[PDB]
């Protein structure tokens, strides 16, 4: 039997099949492994943040404003926590030498990753927990 007997059969039998819906993997955030986490990792003058989820915006924002105060009142620079509003939640400030993030009185609590910090050196790459919501501060353009 020259025919049919020489048919390759697929090994590794799979009867535990599922529907191939076709999940398409991709990336959108800049996540190339930082060569030297220092001055060349960090941005120059301006920096950026992405909102990982929150009523504050839920988008990505550029900070080139010397002092950006997070509140929720018409006179506040940016709107932060809407559902659980502290009059003065947090304040993101960019300084000619360094980046600094200060809690100005968030009742929900401002935590860096999982660390309670009322003042923190603003780090690019880590996520700032604003109450329950999630904001990530990243290194903006060094260009």
- The residue among 60, 58, 59, 55 whose CA lies nearest residue 72 is 55
Determine if residue 15 is left, alpha or beta; phi over 0 gives left, psi from -120 to 50 gives alpha, anything else beta: alpha
Q: Which residues of 27-53 are buried (b: 16+ CB within 10 A; e: fewer)?
A: eeeeeeeeeeeeeeebbeeebbbbbee
What domains sit in the chain, N to C, each tagged with a CATH number?
Answer: 27-143 (2.60.200.20)
Strands 119-121 and 99-103: antiparallel
Q: Answer whether 78's CB lies under 8 Å from 56's CB.
A: yes
Report the alpha-carbon distance of residue 74 to residue 67 in Å, rounded.
17
For residue 124, report the phi and psi dihedrals to the nearest 5 degrees.
-90, 120
SS (H, E, C) 36-85: CCCCCCCCCCCEEEEEEECCCCCCEEEECCCEEEEECCCCCCEECCCCCC
DSSP type of residue 133: E
- Residue 52 CA, chain-centre distance (Å), reads 5
- In sequence order, the 6+-apart residues with CB closer than 8 A to the CB of 80 are 54, 56, 70, 71, 72, 86, 89, 90, 130
Angle, alpha carbons 63-66-67 (nearest 5°): 90
- Residue 110 CA, chain-centre distance (Å), reads 15
Report the alpha-carbon distance of residue 7 to residue 54 in Å, rounded.
57
Report how far apart the first and last C-alpha atoms of the chain are (Å, whole number): 70
């Amino acid at each position: 039997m020259s025919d049919n007997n020489g048919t390759p059969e697929p090994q590794v039998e799979t009867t535990s099949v599922f529907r191939a819906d076709l999940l398409k993997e991709m990336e959108s955030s800049t996540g190339t492994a930082p060569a030297s986490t220092g001055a060349e990792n960090l941005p120059a003058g301006s920096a950026l943040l992405v909102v990982k989820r929150g009523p504050n915006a839920g988008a990505r924002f550029l900070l080139d404003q010397p002092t950006t105060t997070a509140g929720r009142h018409p006179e506040s620079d940016i709107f932060l926590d809407d559902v659980t509003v502290s009059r003065r939640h947090a304040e993101f400030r960019i300084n000619e030498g360094e980046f600094e993030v200060v809690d100005v009185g968030s009742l929900n609590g401002t935590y860096v990753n999982r660390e309670p910090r009322n003042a923190q050196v603003m780090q690019t790459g880590d996520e700032i927990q604003i109450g329950k919501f999630r904001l990530v501060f990243l290194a903006g353009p060094a260009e």
